[PDB]
Amino acid sequence: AGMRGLMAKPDGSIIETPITANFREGLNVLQYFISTHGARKGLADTALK
Amino acid sequence: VDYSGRSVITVGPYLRLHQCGLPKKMALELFKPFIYGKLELRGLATTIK
Amino acid sequence: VYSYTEKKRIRKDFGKRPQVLDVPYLLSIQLDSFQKFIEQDPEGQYGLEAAFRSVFPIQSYSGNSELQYVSYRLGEPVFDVQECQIRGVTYSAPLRVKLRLVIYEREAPEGTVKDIKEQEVYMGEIPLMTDNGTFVINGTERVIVSQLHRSPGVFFDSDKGKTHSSGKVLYNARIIPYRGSWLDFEFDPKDNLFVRIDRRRKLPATIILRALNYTTEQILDLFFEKVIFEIRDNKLQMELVPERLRGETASFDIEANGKVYVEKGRRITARHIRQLEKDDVKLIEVPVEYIAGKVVAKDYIDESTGELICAANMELSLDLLAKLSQSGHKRIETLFTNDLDHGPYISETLRVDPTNDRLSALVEIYRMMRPGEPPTREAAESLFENLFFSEDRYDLSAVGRMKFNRSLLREEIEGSGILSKDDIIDVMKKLIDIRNGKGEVDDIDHLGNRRIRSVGEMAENQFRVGLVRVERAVKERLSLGDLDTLMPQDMINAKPISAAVKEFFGSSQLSQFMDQNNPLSEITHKRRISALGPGGLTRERAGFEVRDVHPTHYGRVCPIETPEGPNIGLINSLSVYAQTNEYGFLETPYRKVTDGVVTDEIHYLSAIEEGNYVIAQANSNLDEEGHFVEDLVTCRSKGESSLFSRDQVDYMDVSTQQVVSVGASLIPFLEHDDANRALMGANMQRQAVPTLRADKPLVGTGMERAVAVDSGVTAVAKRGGVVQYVDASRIVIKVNEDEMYPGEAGIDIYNLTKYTRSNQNTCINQMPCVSLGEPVERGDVLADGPSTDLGELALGQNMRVAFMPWNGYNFEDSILVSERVVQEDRFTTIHIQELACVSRDTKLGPEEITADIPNVGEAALSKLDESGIVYIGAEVTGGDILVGKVTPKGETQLTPEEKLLRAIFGEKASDVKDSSLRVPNGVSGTVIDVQVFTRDGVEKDKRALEIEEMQLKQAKKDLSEELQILEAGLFSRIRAVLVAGGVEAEKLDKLPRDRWLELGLTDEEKQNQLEQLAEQYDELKHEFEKKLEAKRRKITQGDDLAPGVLKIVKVYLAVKRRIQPGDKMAGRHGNKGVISKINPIEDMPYDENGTPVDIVLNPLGVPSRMNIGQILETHLGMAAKGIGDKINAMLKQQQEVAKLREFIQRAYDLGADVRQKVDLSTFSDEEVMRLAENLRKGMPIATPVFDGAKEAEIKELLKLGDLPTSGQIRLYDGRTGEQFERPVTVGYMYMLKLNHLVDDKMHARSTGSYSLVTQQPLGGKAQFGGQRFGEMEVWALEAYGAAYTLQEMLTVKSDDVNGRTKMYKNIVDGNHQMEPGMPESFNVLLKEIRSLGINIELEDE
Amino acid sequence: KAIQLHPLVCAAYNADFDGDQMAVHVPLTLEAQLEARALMMSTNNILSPA
DNA sequence: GAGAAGCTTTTAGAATTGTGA
DNA sequence: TCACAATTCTAAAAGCAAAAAAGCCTTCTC
Ligand SMILES: [Mg+2]
């Protein structure tokens, strides 16, 4: 419902611009790309821990 | 090990929590020597073959 | 306008952005590469020409002998792709090379040759590539996967923090050649350039400079500045370059030109620098202490004594200043060291250098490389001058030279693939520059540093390996000079080249078994990029920076399509519009944005050009004539997104779906799914198995047509025409006059592919979708492959869903299906097995395949025929006999009396062991095909003759039919040409159809065309006869088999599998599940209209697994099916076309300003009813990926129908008739049936066979086997008090042989007790340890 | 063809029903049957040992 | 043909030697 | 002498299961 907030890039540096859109509305291409950074990081972490 | 099998698990909400559902096929495949014992006991088959 | 295959069913297309670029042909990555491999290329850049012209001509060892290349040719394959898939061989072309051999004369190394000698040569076959992009290597279809690897060139890494645990940063520079040896320049914790060649012993750098003939004076001249010291009045007033002392703190006074500039203990600030510039301070008074700590640069010798004063590069002292002052040397040149910018790195390395001269350097290099033997001068110089400086053992490619010269800023983009003095010295200077602070380090994840190999490149590399092996062989065979003989065909050995190319294509890491149970699976296997393979990294050696999404992946690699598990992040997939440079780097298309207006010229940008521009976003609003409507836009400039003014953007994206792959662009409402579930649903859409009946999605993305047409499953009309004839197996198309060649009247014949077998044992089957007498244009689907529906891709079925709990039967991820789903066979699938019975040449006599099996009655022989093979169409079950085979087990004589029984049978000494082929247990099916391969020189049995005669009749009928229909068309065209020009219609049929050129017509171009068609007919006759004769030849030919084998009988069973509790059942949004109950129809929830719901899911899967896309898909599917229900209501209560066209127009014309305009005033009222019939199942809807529909549009489409806008209706309990409270979300969702079937996962065993070395059960369902009781289960049993369970599982159920036999005998005798024993694996271990010197023994009791 | 597992014991196994498999073993001797009935029965394992 | 004769992980611990006092 | 410390050599890196394919020394005959 609310915005999904701020996402960190692979280096851990928090990206300045947040994702102000939420999943009820649509993310656009750039916001989704950042979300993919985060998701791939998480999946790799689990699969290799 | 012998006397072991696999299969996919589903949910049975009617069981009491000390129970599981075993397919008839797997049950017959895992319990063959016991069935031979009972068959020869009842006399339904004289020799093992 | 609408192509006729598209007028039958239009997809309601939301999405508002115009599509400036069509989606390209999806298989270009494979086809273009392999085309560049095998082509005749003048000027010789790519492929076989490149390899040959690179390795040839041959120059003998001063033997006046050479082999010259001329040209090459590819013959035609002996078999076709299908006849090769059946016979189990490779689909390949012979390679015929025109070679010459010319030999010179003595004392004539350049004059005219004595003789020339020329003919063909056969260096083996090369596998060809099918028109789809696949190969056939042993009858099986295979795919060679593209490879992302490190680009050749120079890379400046960091290795920043972990080393030395001190916070100091090392630097290194590596050189990657395409082929050759590596070369490092790596720092140390103490700031000294070391070098290593292929990661051997780390070693001081300067050696190689000394190996390259550089005296120390030259080295210091190259790597350092010079500072002047002149003997003068006193104290050697130093000649200062004005900017040298910038930033340096002063330590004394500086006076020159009668002006004092700087006081001691004060740095030269900006004001001091300006003063120095203004005063032209050149010669300054300085003490001698300044020269105390400098370094002599150029070697200084003594002149009066004729001796040496000081050596180059050693620290000076004041006594040496006095000594050289009195020697005559008046000018002194020192090196401008520093502590801010110019460190003494090279100088310190020279200090650490032990050697003195190039001989010592090369000896040290030789010892480092090949340690153990005595260095010698010639060996050392040869080793060094072949390490990096030879065409044979080192090559920077064209891409390598480009990247090299681009890293060092040199302007040239072409050159030599060989390192040089200038190149290495430039690398050293650049690396030192990075150290000093002026420069940065490469990131190895950048897609500009990574390059793609495709089939052509790898195949050419392996062919080059084979060629150089043949080169050495021919070199040796020709060095032993024999001339006027030895045609250039005998010294040539095809075995190495064939072995190398076959090793690549058949057994390689990147040449893998084709994934084939879905058109999407095939197409996304062909567009797959892998960072693994020969020359790449590995699964366990992969870090996390390579497992990750870099910002330059945008538009080139998909972020959300990669396999989970171990090799995540290394098996990436290539985006829809991604492409490749001439050099092998990924590029993606953008639109130029000039002067604010956004034009439509497409530039293809690579990652190292994307960083120099500001690229706008695909969904940034455009107004009329192409301005940015709002005055500032979101872009990305330097690997980072941010918001920019309007007149700064240089490019725009081509579409909103260029960032994703083709698997992830068929998930509607992707932007409403969390990336993890998008990944799972993208990967999980490829495991879907084709269904008995294909069913389109109601909610799609419009990408279905492209995916189905661009794969080789449908049958697409090559040339537009009129459907002459249709059949389940054939389609004949009469071509149109506008589209026809001068001669060759011709007709397009498409033979469809009926129930044959795929790599995953599924069924591929083509169904005609056209009907007789129908127009077809080019690019029109005529037959529907598997998982296709009128051209559209159709992977599953669109079921009716309700999201609610139901008595715990969809508890965690289970699914509750109704019986109406199984009665309608909506998820029934066909699977084709294959079973081979191979009769071998065994000792004591070969097997026979007769039907006279011993120790079986006639009940199991009721199915086999006379020859001992089952009948086609026979409904076999598990345990039956498919082929009756018997092995001879040797003569036997139990007792003399028993012979009488053998005499009674009439067996007459035959005692054979039964070894027949039996149906593997539990698989009911029908025998749909049988094949028999027989070795040359064995007698074909009755059924072999029957099969051969049948297929001979089929071949003759097929060729007769094709020639008959072609000549029918040819004579029809002849008559059509006879429409005018003296036509005698009454005399047209006075004679049979053959001789129509003798009628009365003028002798003009019309008669020339008549003769053209007649000669075409004659050539058709000749080609028919030749083809028929050849097919008769090869059909009777006995196939080539393995060694020591007589004949192979292959049976095919066609099983039909229906869904059952335990089958996996997914959707497109990553929502898996296992069917847990097949419910009766009257038990399911139903609505006020009495309609039951087909499937029931759990709402609890939505919040935690944030995939909101499935609820939106459910709502939009409900809306679409409502439109279809109204259309059905109209089309049933028979109406007139006015109301239907008005309503369908109302449906096709709602939303925001959307691309497509469908106007039904042009549909001619006859195909409006056809369209309505196709729409009575629900109007299909296209919802593009990131510019899809909106909830307002969904609500409007719901309100068009008579559905509630909330999406939730009122349901009633199926078995209590009671209204559920809380209106529930029902709608239509596209369900897939994944290929994880419970009847393939179940397995059980009481007893069976055991391994040899360790008498344990075998492992696997394939070879009937037991379950592993691993060590974690052992621990879990130890954590209970379960000691007896553990003992029995360790001894009597795995290893203890006598114990387990006794346990069996006890169980069958109603006694439950075990004899412990000691495992046999432990005895095996004891022997394995005693086979060393160790003596491990069990002590006494 | 699938094993029906009680809903409550799924937390102990960490098992959902989206494709997981399970292996089943038979205790033969009499003491192993007593151990299964007394030490390992699912009605004894209601508390965690952690 | 059948049968021989003969060119990249990362971390961490433990053993050398290589100056350094 | 007798002590730190840079080199370098050695070990380790989850479990369970399904399917498929390719193989099981060189070479030297005459
Ligand atoms: Mg699971």
From Swiss-Prot, chain A:
Post-translational modification: Acetylated on several lysine residues in the presence of glucose.
Resulting phenotype, P18 to S/T: Resistant to antibiotics salinamide A and B
Biotechnological utility: Co-administration of salinamide and rifampicin or salinamide and myxopyronin suppresses the emergence of resistance to both antibiotics.
Effect of A8E: Resistant to antibiotics salinamide A and B
Cleaved signal peptide residues: none
Assembly and oligomerization: The RNAP catalytic core consists of 2 alpha, 1 beta, 1 beta' and 1 omega subunit. When a sigma factor is associated with the core the holoenzyme is formed, which can initiate transcription. The rRNA transcription and antitermination complex (rrnTAC) consists of RNAP, NusA, NusB, NusE (rpsJ), NusG, SubB, ribosomal protein S4, DNA and precursor rRNA; S4 is more flexible than other subunits.
Role: DNA-dependent RNA polymerase (RNAP) catalyzes the transcription of DNA into RNA using the four ribonucleoside triphosphates as substrates.
Sequence similarity: Belongs to the RNA polymerase beta' chain family.
Annotated protein name in UniProt: DNA-directed RNA polymerase subunit beta'
The organism of origin for this protein: Escherichia coli (strain K12)
UniProtKB/Swiss-Prot annotation, chain C:
Name of the protein this chain belongs to: DNA-directed RNA polymerase subunit beta
Effect annotated for changing I568S: Resistant to antibiotics salinamide A and B
Domain of life (superkingdom): Bacteria
Annotated GO CC locations: cytoplasm; cytosol; cytosolic DNA-directed RNA polymerase complex; membrane; transcription elongation factor complex
Gene this chain is encoded by: rpoB
Family label: Belongs to the RNA polymerase beta chain family.
Result after altering D674 to A/G: Resistant to antibiotics salinamide A and B
Gene Ontology biological-process entries: bacterial-type flagellum assembly; bacterial-type flagellum-dependent cell motility; cell motility; cellular response to cell envelope stress; DNA-templated transcription initiation; intracellular iron ion homeostasis; nitrate assimilation; regulation of DNA-templated transcription elongation
Enzyme class: transferase
